[PDB]
Design an enzyme around this catalytic site. Sequence first.
Site, mmCIF file in Angstrom:
data_model
loop_
_atom_site.group_PDB
_atom_site.id
_atom_site.type_symbol
_atom_site.label_atom_id
_atom_site.label_comp_id
_atom_site.label_asym_id
_atom_site.label_seq_id
_atom_site.Cartn_x
_atom_site.Cartn_y
_atom_site.Cartn_z
ATOM 1 N N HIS A 61 0.830 -1.133 0.061
ATOM 2 C CA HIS A 61 -0.153 0.032 -0.013
ATOM 3 C C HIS A 61 0.912 1.236 -0.001
ATOM 4 C CE1 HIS A 61 -3.176 -2.802 1.109
ATOM 5 N NE2 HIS A 61 -2.550 -3.128 2.164
ATOM 6 N N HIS A 91 5.268 7.047 6.670
ATOM 7 C CA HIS A 91 5.278 6.501 5.420
ATOM 8 C C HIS A 91 4.613 7.738 4.592
ATOM 9 C CE1 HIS A 91 1.174 6.192 7.394
ATOM 10 N NE2 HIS A 91 0.881 6.657 6.312
ATOM 11 N N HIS A 93 2.100 9.067 1.012
ATOM 12 C CA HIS A 93 1.302 8.859 -0.257
ATOM 13 C C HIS A 93 1.520 9.706 -1.261
ATOM 14 C CE1 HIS A 93 -1.516 6.908 2.740
ATOM 15 N NE2 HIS A 93 -1.040 7.712 3.704
ATOM 16 N N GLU A 103 -3.456 13.489 0.545
ATOM 17 C CA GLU A 103 -4.405 12.971 1.204
ATOM 18 C C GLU A 103 -5.255 14.358 1.504
ATOM 19 O OE1 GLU A 103 -3.586 9.710 3.521
ATOM 20 O OE2 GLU A 103 -4.409 8.601 1.682
ATOM 21 N N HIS A 116 3.270 11.036 6.470
ATOM 22 C CA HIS A 116 2.707 10.853 7.698
ATOM 23 C C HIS A 116 3.499 10.082 8.834
ATOM 24 C CE1 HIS A 116 -1.411 10.548 5.437
ATOM 25 N NE2 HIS A 116 -0.981 11.774 5.675
ATOM 26 N N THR A 195 -6.446 6.935 7.372
ATOM 27 C CA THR A 195 -6.897 7.162 5.899
ATOM 28 C C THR A 195 -6.885 5.748 5.023
ATOM 29 O OG1 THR A 195 -4.654 7.744 4.986
ATOM 30 C CG2 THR A 195 -5.919 9.400 5.870
HETATM 31 C C1 LIG Z 1 -4.317 -0.923 12.257
HETATM 32 C C2 LIG Z 1 -3.034 -0.589 11.482
HETATM 33 C C3 LIG Z 1 -3.084 0.783 11.075
HETATM 34 C C4 LIG Z 1 -2.063 1.267 9.986
HETATM 35 C C5 LIG Z 1 -2.081 2.447 9.601
HETATM 36 C C6 LIG Z 1 -1.275 3.702 9.985
HETATM 37 C C7 LIG Z 1 -1.495 4.762 9.648
HETATM 38 C C8 LIG Z 1 -2.393 5.032 8.882
HETATM 39 S S1 LIG Z 1 -2.572 6.802 8.209
HETATM 40 N N1 LIG Z 1 -2.571 6.915 6.572
HETATM 41 O O1 LIG Z 1 -1.422 7.519 8.756
HETATM 42 O O2 LIG Z 1 -3.953 7.238 8.543
HETATM 43 C C9 LIG Z 1 -3.025 4.200 8.230
HETATM 44 C C10 LIG Z 1 -3.031 2.929 8.583
HETATM 45 ZN ZN LIG Z 2 -0.837 7.791 5.548
#
Ligand SMILES: CCCCc1ccc(S(N)(=O)=O)cc1
Ligand SMILES: [Zn+2]
Length: 257
Positions: A61, A91, A93, A103, A116, A195
Amino acid sequence: HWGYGKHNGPEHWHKDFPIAKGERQSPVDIDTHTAKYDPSLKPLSVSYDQATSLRILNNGHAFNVEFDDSQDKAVLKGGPLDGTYRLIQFHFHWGSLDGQGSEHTVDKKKYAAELHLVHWNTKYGDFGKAVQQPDGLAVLGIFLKVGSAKPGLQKVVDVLDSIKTKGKSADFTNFDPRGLLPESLDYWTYPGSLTTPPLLECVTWIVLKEPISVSSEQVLKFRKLNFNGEGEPEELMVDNWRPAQPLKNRQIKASFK
Ligand SMILES: CCCCc1ccc(S(N)(=O)=O)cc1
Ligand SMILES: [Zn+2]
């Protein structure tokens, strides 16, 4: 099997994750004229000097740079936050073109990418317990625009060739996330969600106003990653962003007058 394609993307997520249509989903558009300065916000404290990065992972992802969060080594405090939030991973996007990828949007403007930095509230003991709480996570979001190179990003860029496909990881010790910040910590904040699935409504979002600049070559290397696993048909990892969601009964607060 959620993803970012036509057949499994954001408009499908609600079937398996009904909270996708919830009351505090992220991201959102930040209307800068409607956001209000909040004098109750305390100074924001980004304390990353003792951060211990461990590994970089292509999870199909995005890619995550993971940190040792077994002690208070890299933490976020202050601002809208009560208590201490420990950095677990960061990470990005990003888009297929420089005109999209973020985002959050700012007056409907999309940036080329969005970083993020994900933190969990230490009062809940572990990340998995934190995500079950309305104040479990704090995500520091930083926009990327294309211009001059970001020197502190290059070490990330240069390891991506080794994690091209889903499930690949590489050692990524001794990375300093302070090199990814802009000069100013001015920010907007609001209560929201993850997100991506599972879209849990556990995040205090802190979105910095000042973007960082990265070079075209740096973001082009993000776009050479693959969503697919090794030996499968190549699907470039691009446009791994969720669009803005309804603000509903929320106010965005600004840290700056
Ligand atoms: C329960 C695992 C969740 C992992 C996860 C961590 C951070 C985001 S974000 N894009 O920063 O809102 C999305 C997913
Ligand atoms: Zn994110």
